[PDB]
């Protein structure tokens, strides 16, 4: 993720087939001739897409130019949460499935995985960051506290941002409960709230493993519902 002063991020296409699939996902959703109500609604929950971008002198080098969802924040607090029971896709080999399940064997049980967070602390005027190993450490016993950490600014628990997050996730959940044409594996929700101020963003990202489907995305829904339940329990802290 390259953050550009103009309010965008550049995301480099991952190696094939992942990068190409993500490009084609954005292209389908943001097709200027799209009249599919499901895809038109989905746009609300993605970063705005500004098309494929390559350096003037390097057409080999493929990026997605995307909206920087954090741009309108002063001190953005950022959490990336992978959603679903499976982070392997329907065409994974047995080895690929193990690779993926072994990354976090609780994925089936919990339905989400914190990929990281960046949390502004007011008292120190500083950020604390958690990496992939944080979320992968979390168990049924510690997931609630693990998520809570995102909404603690070193003085209070930001229950406003928690409530706002539930409300925005609910709209995404509603989108998933009214579509049976896409299934999303290893995709994430990006949570942003203002650390320095009620603004909150919850957007879907990471579409290297979105596939056509004829079913509800039950794994994604499970994850959304479990994540909401956790956030809801945090409101009782
Ligand atoms: C500073 C910072 C940190 C992180 C983790 C994400 C972002 C971020 O802000 N707007 C973002 C928009 C998109 C993506 C990735 C999209 C994809 O994989 O499809 C990431 C973003 C910004």
Residue 89, token pair as written in the block: 């896709």
- The whole-angstrom separation of Cα 78 and Cα 95 is 32
**Cα 62 to chain center, whole Å?**
21
DSSP conformation letters of 151-214: GB-SS-B-HHHHHHHHHHHHHHHHHHTT--SEEESSEEEEEEEE-----EEEEEE--TTEEE-S
Partners of 205 in the β-ladder: 188
- CB of 113 closer than 6 angstroms to any ligand 1 atom: no
3-state secondary structure 125-142: CEEEEECHHHHCCCCCCC
CB of 156 closer than 8 Å to CB of 141: no
**How many other CB atoms sit within 10 Å of the CB of residue 56?**
5
- CB of 192 closer than 6 angstroms to any ligand 1 atom: no
- The whole-angstrom separation of Cα 51 and Cα 166 is 30
- CB of 66 closer than 6 angstroms to any ligand 1 atom: yes
Cα angle 70, 163, 140; round to 5: 95
Nearest residue CA, atom 10 of ligand 1? 68
What's the first-to-final CA gap in the chain, in angstroms?
Answer: 34
**How many other CB atoms sit within 10 Å of the CB of residue 111?**
24
Experimental technique, in short, is: X-ray
Print burial letters for 71-110: b (CB count within 10 Å at least 16), e (below 16): bebebbbbbbbbbbbbbbbeebeeeeeeebbeebebbeeb
Query: Which residue out of 68, 71, 81 has the highest number of ligand 1 atoms within 8 Å of its CB and is therefore the one to mutate?
Result: 68
- Reading phi first (left if > 0) and then psi (alpha if -120 to 50, else beta), residue 181 is in alpha
């Amino acid at each position: 993720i390259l953050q550009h002063p103009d309010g965008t991020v550049l995301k480099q296409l991952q190696p094939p087939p992942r990068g190409p699939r993500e490009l084609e996902f954005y292209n389908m959703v943001y097709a200027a001739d799209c009249f599919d109500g499901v895809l038109l609604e989905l746009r609300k929950y993605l970063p705005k897409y500004y098309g494929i971008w390559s350096p003037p002198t390097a057409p080999n080098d493929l990026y997605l130019k995307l909206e920087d969802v954090t741009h309108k924040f002063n001190k953005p607090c950022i959490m990336d949460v992978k959603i679903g029971q499976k982070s392997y896709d329907p065409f994974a080999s047995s080895e690929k499935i193990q690779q993926q399940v072994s990354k976090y064997p609780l994925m089936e049980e919990i339905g989400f995985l914190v990929l990281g967070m960046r949390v502004y602390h007011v008292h120190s005027d500083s950020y604390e960051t958690e990496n992939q190993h944080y979320g992968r450490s979390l168990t049924k016993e510690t997931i609630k506290d693990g998520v809570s950490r995102f909404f603690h600014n070193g003085y209070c628990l930001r229950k406003d941002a928690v409530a706002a997050s539930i409300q925005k996730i609910e709209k995404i959940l509603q989108w998933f409960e009214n579509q049976k044409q896409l299934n999303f594996y290893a995709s994430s929700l990006l949570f942003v709230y203002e650390g320095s101020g009620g603004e909150v963003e919850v957007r879907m990202i990471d579409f290297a493993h979105v596939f056509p489907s004829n079913t509800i995305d039950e794994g994604y829904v499970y994850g959304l519902k479990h994540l909401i339940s956790v956030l809801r329990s945090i409101l009782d802290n």
